[PDB]
UniProtKB/Swiss-Prot annotation, chains A, B:
Lineage: Bacteria, Pseudomonadati, Pseudomonadota, Gammaproteobacteria, Enterobacterales
Name of the protein: 2-C-methyl-D-erythritol 4-phosphate cytidylyltransferase
Function (record text): Catalyzes the formation of 4-diphosphocytidyl-2-C-methyl-D-erythritol from CTP and 2-C-methyl-D-erythritol 4-phosphate (MEP).
GO molecular function: 2-C-methyl-D-erythritol 4-phosphate cytidylyltransferase activity; identical protein binding; magnesium ion binding
Family: Belongs to the IspD/TarI cytidylyltransferase family. IspD subfamily.
Source species: Escherichia coli (strain K12)
Coiled coil: none
GO term, biological process aspect, one: isopentenyl diphosphate biosynthetic process, methylerythritol 4-phosphate pathway
Assigned keywords, A-Z: Cobalt, Isoprene biosynthesis, Magnesium, Manganese, Nucleotidyltransferase, Transferase
Entry's Gene Ontology cellular component terms: cytosol
Domain of life: Bacteria
PROSITE patterns: ISPD (PS01295)
Length: 225, 225
């Protein structure tokens, strides 16, 4: 019952990084962002497998140690993140629960990961790591850079990953959301579309996603310095 | 017309920092957070004066170089931030426009500051530095840590400081908001309460507010390393 399979969508190109090299293959130390991410998942004993979805043609993955790891399986991802997650879910085996984690979030801590996994003993829907909103938030007027009003930040959260859900429920919700042309952001949004309400497990705010050039040095700082 | 007076509320105790020393008096390099903040404002030629509101009894301010600076005036702040800003606005002289900046945001860049000041030539309401929301945001169900739904991040912004407004309009709006018992967060929220819609001037996301222990090292990283 405690066996978990992780799915890491890593089929993007990181166009917002300026590098011709996909960001997940940029390094911090001498390990790639993808490796930092994958190894944080493999550190928890319950993670028995990790399925990494890569772009077809991606010739870099094969040159990493992950390519020959007994607990790692690679599959081709798709056009959008949701497509890549589905492809990963297809190779997840018989795992009852799945952990979906962005290849671009290398700063994941073990304590957050462990608290997220505890959801399988107390939830039938699952949940996500999330950080509470700290800044005062403003909603802009439609099409203009003028403030319409302040958005109550009480009960407002930044969605992070991993996101942990029963495997087949996630597969079904992503499948339905996509087929009905729903607007999908993260895995939780697919459950949301189908009427579910995933749990919010508070996590560290330094669990950042490397998206822009400056993020590389910040991620490096968070890992240590 | 181009003369600006800045007001820096610095009368808080930074209880969330764990230090008995008020956070604005913690140092980065050999300059206090308050000094980094104040000096960033004084770097722009239009800032002719800075009024710093401190807690009564605050015995630290007097020991800093700012205490004898010809362009700096100190006043006693109040119970809440809005009270301290009002006290500062009272000593702002005849300045037509005022810049309100948190003592705890030492990472302000000159380019953002200059773009914010340009509002006086194109607005009668003023505006604030703000950073666009990047993460997918979730709204929690009332009183529970379960996701109600995803909040559209399009047109959603993190409010930062400085916040720049015509002096007397700001004074009047803060005065009314407080008298009517409105919920005030930043200076823009006071204008909002009175029917105004301040401008959003996009600024750097590394313009952070030192609030928790870990923020000190992050602020130090952003300044340089
Ligand atoms: N078709 C896609 C698109 C994205 N991803 C993965 O989704 C995670 C994070 O999404 P994001 O950073 O938003 O996408 P990128 O394509 O990596 O970056 P950009 O949007 O700047 O091109 C990344 O690990 C990325 O590789 C994926 O597997 N398949
Ligand atoms: N009565 C108050 C409360 C706050 N501030 C100032 O408001 C700015 C930022 O607000 P915040 O960080 O939220 O308040 P602090 O009191 O400094 O910290 P804490 O809430 O953890 O006690 C700080 O520069 C702080 O000194 C102030 O001048 N007067
Ligand atoms: Ca392991
Ligand atoms: Ca000057
Ligand atoms: Mg993308
Ligand atoms: Mg406070």
């Amino acid at each position: 019952h405690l066996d978990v399979c992780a799915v890491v969508p890593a089929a993007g190109f990181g166009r917002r990084m300026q590098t011709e090299c996909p960001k997940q293959y940029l390094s911090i130390g001498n390990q790639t962002i993808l490796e930092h991410s994958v190894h944080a998942l493999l550190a928890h004993p319950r993670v028995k497998r990790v399925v990494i979805a890569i772009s077809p043609g991606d010739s870099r993955f094969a040159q990493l140690p992950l390519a020959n790891h007994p607990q790692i399986t690679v599959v081709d991802g798709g056009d959008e993140r949701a497509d890549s997650v589905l492809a990963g879910l297809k190779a997840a085996g018989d795992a009852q629960w799945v952990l979906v984690h962005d290849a671009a979030r290398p700063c994941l801590h073990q304590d957050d990961l462990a608290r997220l996994l505890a959801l399988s003993e107390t939830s039938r829907t699952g949940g996500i790591l999330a950080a509470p909103v700290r800044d005062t938030m403003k909603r802009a007027e439609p099409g203009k850079n003028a403030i319409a009003h302040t958005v109550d930040r009480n009960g407002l959260w930044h969605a992070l990953t991993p996101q942990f859900f029963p495997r087949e429920l996630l597969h079904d919700c992503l499948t339905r959301a996509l087929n009905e042309g729903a607007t999908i952001t993260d895995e939780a949004s697919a459950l949301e579309y189908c009427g579910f309400h995933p749990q919010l497990v508070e996590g560290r705010a330094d669990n950042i996603k490397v998206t822009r050039p400056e993020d590389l040095a910040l991620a490096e700082f968070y890992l240590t310095r």
